Enzyme design. Structure first.
Site, PDB file in Angstrom:
ATOM      1  N   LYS A   1      27.324   0.891   0.642  1.00  0.00           N
ATOM      2  CA  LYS A   1      25.619   0.466   0.875  1.00  0.00           C
ATOM      3  C   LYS A   1      25.823  -0.856   0.744  1.00  0.00           C
ATOM      4  O   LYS A   1      25.106  -1.936   0.376  1.00  0.00           O
ATOM      5  CB  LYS A   1      24.659   1.069  -0.229  1.00  0.00           C
TER       6      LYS A   1
ATOM      7  N   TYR B   1      32.790   2.327 -12.184  1.00  0.00           N
ATOM      8  CA  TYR B   1      33.824   2.696 -13.253  1.00  0.00           C
ATOM      9  C   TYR B   1      34.222   1.724 -14.061  1.00  0.00           C
ATOM     10  O   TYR B   1      35.171   2.164 -14.963  1.00  0.00           O
ATOM     11  CB  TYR B   1      33.960   3.639 -12.742  1.00  0.00           C
TER      12      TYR B   1
ATOM     13  N   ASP C   1      31.680  10.231  -6.468  1.00  0.00           N
ATOM     14  CA  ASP C   1      31.903  11.074  -7.143  1.00  0.00           C
ATOM     15  C   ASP C   1      30.336  11.980  -6.637  1.00  0.00           C
ATOM     16  O   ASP C   1      30.527  12.942  -6.962  1.00  0.00           O
ATOM     17  CB  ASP C   1      30.827  10.432  -8.827  1.00  0.00           C
TER      18      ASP C   1
ATOM     19  N   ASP D   1      22.832   6.778   2.009  1.00  0.00           N
ATOM     20  CA  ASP D   1      21.215   7.800   1.381  1.00  0.00           C
ATOM     21  C   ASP D   1      21.117   9.014   3.161  1.00  0.00           C
ATOM     22  O   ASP D   1      21.173   9.769   2.738  1.00  0.00           O
ATOM     23  CB  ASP D   1      20.452   6.825   1.282  1.00  0.00           C
TER      24      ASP D   1
HETATM   25  N1  LIG Z   1      12.437   1.276   4.204  1.00  0.00           N
HETATM   26  C1  LIG Z   1      13.098   1.697   5.707  1.00  0.00           C
HETATM   27  O1  LIG Z   1      12.033   0.405   6.021  1.00  0.00           O
HETATM   28  C2  LIG Z   1      14.432   1.526   5.866  1.00  0.00           C
HETATM   29  C3  LIG Z   1      15.024   2.798   4.906  1.00  0.00           C
HETATM   30  C4  LIG Z   1      16.038   3.357   4.736  1.00  0.00           C
HETATM   31  C5  LIG Z   1      17.494   2.729   6.630  1.00  0.00           C
HETATM   32  N2  LIG Z   1      16.452   1.160   6.507  1.00  0.00           N
HETATM   33  C6  LIG Z   1      16.881  -0.031   7.368  1.00  0.00           C
HETATM   34  O2  LIG Z   1      17.475   0.379   8.691  1.00  0.00           O
HETATM   35  C7  LIG Z   1      18.515   0.528   9.275  1.00  0.00           C
HETATM   36  C8  LIG Z   1      18.871   1.960   9.559  1.00  0.00           C
HETATM   37  O3  LIG Z   1      19.738   2.789   9.182  1.00  0.00           O
HETATM   38  P1  LIG Z   1      20.328   3.915   8.990  1.00  0.00           P
HETATM   39  O4  LIG Z   1      21.348   4.351  10.666  1.00  0.00           O
HETATM   40  O5  LIG Z   1      21.290   3.924   8.160  1.00  0.00           O
HETATM   41  O6  LIG Z   1      19.331   4.947   8.524  1.00  0.00           O
HETATM   42  P2  LIG Z   1      18.371   5.838   9.808  1.00  0.00           P
HETATM   43  O7  LIG Z   1      17.260   6.108   8.767  1.00  0.00           O
HETATM   44  O8  LIG Z   1      18.242   4.668  10.873  1.00  0.00           O
HETATM   45  O9  LIG Z   1      19.163   6.694  10.398  1.00  0.00           O
HETATM   46  C9  LIG Z   1      19.144   7.523   9.739  1.00  0.00           C
HETATM   47  C10 LIG Z   1      19.482   9.477  11.089  1.00  0.00           C
HETATM   48  O10 LIG Z   1      18.219   9.429  11.275  1.00  0.00           O
HETATM   49  C11 LIG Z   1      18.092   9.575  12.679  1.00  0.00           C
HETATM   50  N3  LIG Z   1      16.256   8.735  12.319  1.00  0.00           N
HETATM   51  C12 LIG Z   1      15.644   8.504  11.372  1.00  0.00           C
HETATM   52  N4  LIG Z   1      14.098   9.111  11.726  1.00  0.00           N
HETATM   53  C13 LIG Z   1      14.355   9.005  12.080  1.00  0.00           C
HETATM   54  C14 LIG Z   1      12.962  10.152  12.654  1.00  0.00           C
HETATM   55  N5  LIG Z   1      11.695   9.957  12.914  1.00  0.00           N
HETATM   56  N6  LIG Z   1      13.510  10.639  14.496  1.00  0.00           N
HETATM   57  C15 LIG Z   1      14.489  11.900  14.155  1.00  0.00           C
HETATM   58  N7  LIG Z   1      15.583  11.244  14.061  1.00  0.00           N
HETATM   59  C16 LIG Z   1      15.282   9.591  12.924  1.00  0.00           C
HETATM   60  C17 LIG Z   1      18.857   8.380  13.054  1.00  0.00           C
HETATM   61  O11 LIG Z   1      18.733   8.542  14.715  1.00  0.00           O
HETATM   62  C18 LIG Z   1      19.836   7.917  12.195  1.00  0.00           C
HETATM   63  O12 LIG Z   1      20.820   9.691  12.731  1.00  0.00           O
HETATM   64  C19 LIG Z   1      19.393  -0.267   8.778  1.00  0.00           C
HETATM   65  O13 LIG Z   1      19.301  -1.568   8.643  1.00  0.00           O
HETATM   66  C20 LIG Z   1      18.787   0.103   7.106  1.00  0.00           C
HETATM   67  O14 LIG Z   1      18.853  -1.275   6.595  1.00  0.00           O
HETATM   68  C21 LIG Z   1      15.388   0.858   6.952  1.00  0.00           C
END
Ligand SMILES: NC(=O)c1ccc[n+]([C@@H]2O[C@H](COP(=O)([O-])OP(=O)(O)OC[C@H]3O[C@@H](n4cnc5c(N)ncnc54)[C@H](O)[C@@H]3O)[C@@H](O)[C@H]2O)c1
Ligand SMILES: NC(=O)c1ccc[n+]([C@@H]2O[C@H](COP(=O)([O-])OP(=O)(O)OC[C@H]3O[C@@H](n4cnc5c(N)ncnc54)[C@H](O)[C@@H]3O)[C@@H](O)[C@H]2O)c1
Lengths: 339, 339
Positions: free
Chosen positions: B174, B123, B231, B207
């Site tokens: 982020k 902003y 926001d 996210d």
């Molecule tokens: N494009 C992909 O490779 C991907 C997407 C988002 C996060 N990132 C990376 O992952 C790492 C962890 O990030 P985060 O903790 O914010 O997000 P995360 O998606 O790893 O976890 C978020 C929540 O969802 C749960 N989890 C997600 N997969 C689900 C399934 N397969 N089993 C049921 N529960 C599951 C986790 O236990 C956690 O409580 C970071 O280093 C991030 O950069 C990679």
């Protein structure tokens, strides 16, 4: 018949990718897997988050099946997921969120697709500290929007709406505050919408849009938006249909495609053997459909839906009382694929 | 007793602000209203979106009650809401989301407060097109994070948690992608958390945090985050407790305070007389508490809750079952305040 680069990834990655490979193989589709390393695993093994051989393999095969990749927070290497998307020009990130019968969710009739611009915006990788000698007094990050990037993601959204027999594209933006980047994206979207009079077009400011998705996600059909907003909105939608454990994403370019779960490496449950493999398996279905195996894709999706509706061999994220683990749920899906 | 700058605003603004004024006066609190113009109304009346006299009035009185202000998309004047926040150094944007008994919502026990940095981030107002002659080929927007802006918003969140007897602060970021801006915000938050060992501290990527908010908002207490994320997340929370018609925000600086609804000018229902006045009335409650009228604030809140729980004189956003308009619901609340 299909040579595909395979990246097991980090944290829960290797288990769910294993599960998905088993489910794919249960369909009878012939796949030569080209196993490569990336992310923290590659840092541990090769000292680099993205070995040249991994990228060479993807550029040769043009198809990649990729488990989640860890990105360090606050420093360290830049996201390998992002680097891959940009190096292979995978400008469209297509994330369907369609309700699964049997979930413990407020809603049962969500049916939306997020089309996320996948190469620029706040993911351009352009930032700096403002320092006096070694003291950091401020920081800046630059979001980049190009005319041509906006044109292709928005045309992809309309073309996809046609191909999928959907009726509406909603462009999500913050153009009241981000008058230049979001504004240019919106202006181009209004411009391109006139080329598609068969498709309804409207626009929403991202904060009102998030409120609307929480309250009545049935309003949405195809969403098209920029990189960060797509990341957030697709995770919101995943939550609406029962969690990140369920949702998959296709990274599409003109010459290549990479399929993955939406979720990350889930370090809080890594090595516990309970991760939901559904998201990776659905990524497998999307990949199979892309490469011209639509019947195998449909059988995978039907098997996943049958197992989740039955509700007896599902992971704890879906049923909290008497759940099984990753491997048991995957085996249940393999058996339904075979029947 | 109290001289307060009053800005009726745009669209549904004047009606709901009217409603709120009546409710405030029903409590018996003494207010000299100093009516001033801003936003599109001021453009139409005075040819400027922020007359100098409006700013002078707020800096004299130090307290402002502000209806929603329209901001044009893609061009036009910069947000008057943002200009006010920055010109008055109102660096903390405090947005409670606490369930109202009787709403048609999946959850009934949401109880969280978003503390949004209110002056910088995306902003900052720093953007440009990249043009050759009059052709726009690209655009850029700069997010700005300063050390002292981050320090003051994160300390505000911890101090607020103590003063409100809340138990956890979650910093939302982020920092895997925005390594400089979000990363500096996160690093400063981790340092400041050690000054508050009585307060529980964790962090979430935005996210995953959105997914968690739609699936399990009860895990959240105080959220502290940057401008755009605040926001988006606070509108998500508004959705969770039954809509933007319900939720209010306080803009706090050391020397001034401005109270408002979270929602906008709602052009789709402007002049239809059906807007929910609850958000504006709750903004009035927050304002009354701030200026040392806590009992009147609590009476306003009790009256609103009683009217919504009863469900017979509520606006169509809450029930299209037996619905009334803005003025109804305001009179019902006045009558309840007033016993
Ligand atoms: N494009 C992909 O490779 C991907 C997407 C988002 C996060 N990132 C990376 O992952 C790492 C962890 O990030 P985060 O903790 O914010 O997000 P995360 O998606 O790893 O976890 C978020 C929540 O969802 C749960 N989890 C997600 N997969 C689900 C399934 N397969 N089993 C049921 N529960 C599951 C986790 O236990 C956690 O409580 C970071 O280093 C991030 O950069 C990679
Ligand atoms: N004044 C500030 O705090 C700020 C807040 C958000 C939007 N803005 C401005 O408001 C304008 C409209 O933006 P928008 O349409 O994306 O958001 P909006 O908040 O005005 O409307 C979003 C949806 O919520 C509904 N509406 C919000 N007020 C509620 C009312 N109290 N009860 C029932 N109806 C509800 C609207 O009808 C609409 O469908 C824009 O110019 C924007 O810049 C004002």
């Amino acid at each position: 018949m299909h040579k595909i680069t395979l990246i097991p990834g980090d944290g829960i990655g290797p288990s769910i990718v294993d599960a998905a490979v088993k489910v794919i193989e249960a369909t009878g589709v012939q796949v030569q897997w080209d196993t490569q390393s990336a992310g923290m695993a590659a840092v541990e093994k090769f000292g680099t988050p993205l070995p040249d051989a991994t990228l060479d393999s993807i550029r040769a095969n043009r198809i990649c099946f990729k488990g989640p990749l860890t990105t360090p927070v606050g420093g360290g290497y830049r996201s390998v997921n992002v680097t891959l998307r940009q190096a292979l020009n995978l400008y469209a990130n297509v994330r369907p969120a369609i309700s699964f019968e049997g979930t413990d969710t407020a809603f049962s009739d969500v049916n939306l697709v997020t089309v996320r611009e996948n190469t620029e915006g706040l993911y351009a990788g352009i930032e700096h500290f403002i320092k006096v000698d070694e003291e950091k007094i401020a920081a800046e990050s630059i979001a980049v929007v190009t005319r041509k990037g906006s044109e292709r993601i928005i045309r992809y959204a309309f073309d996809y709406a046609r191909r999928a027999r959907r009726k509406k594209v909603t462009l999500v933006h913050k153009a009241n505050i981000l008058k230049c980047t979001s504004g240019l994206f919106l202006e181009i979207g209004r411009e391109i919408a006139k080329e598609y009079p068969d498709i309804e077009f409207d626009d929403r400011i991202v904060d009102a849009c998030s409120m609307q998705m929480v309250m009545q996600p049935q309003r949405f059909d195809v969403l098209v938006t920029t990189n960060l907003f797509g990341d957030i909105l697709s995770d919101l939608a995943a939550g609406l249909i029962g969690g990140l454990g369920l949702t998959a994403g296709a990274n599409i370019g003109t010459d290549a495609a990479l399929f993955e779960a939406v979720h990350g490496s889930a370090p809080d449950i890594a090595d516990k053997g309970i991760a939901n493999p559904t998201a990776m398996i659905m990524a497998g279905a999307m990949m199979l459909e892309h490469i011209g195996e639509p019947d195998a894709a449909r059988r995978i999706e039907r098997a996943v839906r049958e197992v989740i509706e039955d509700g007896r061999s599902v992971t704890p994220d879906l049923a909290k009382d008497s759940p099984c683990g990753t491997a048991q749920m995957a085996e249940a899906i393999v058996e339904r694929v075979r029947q």
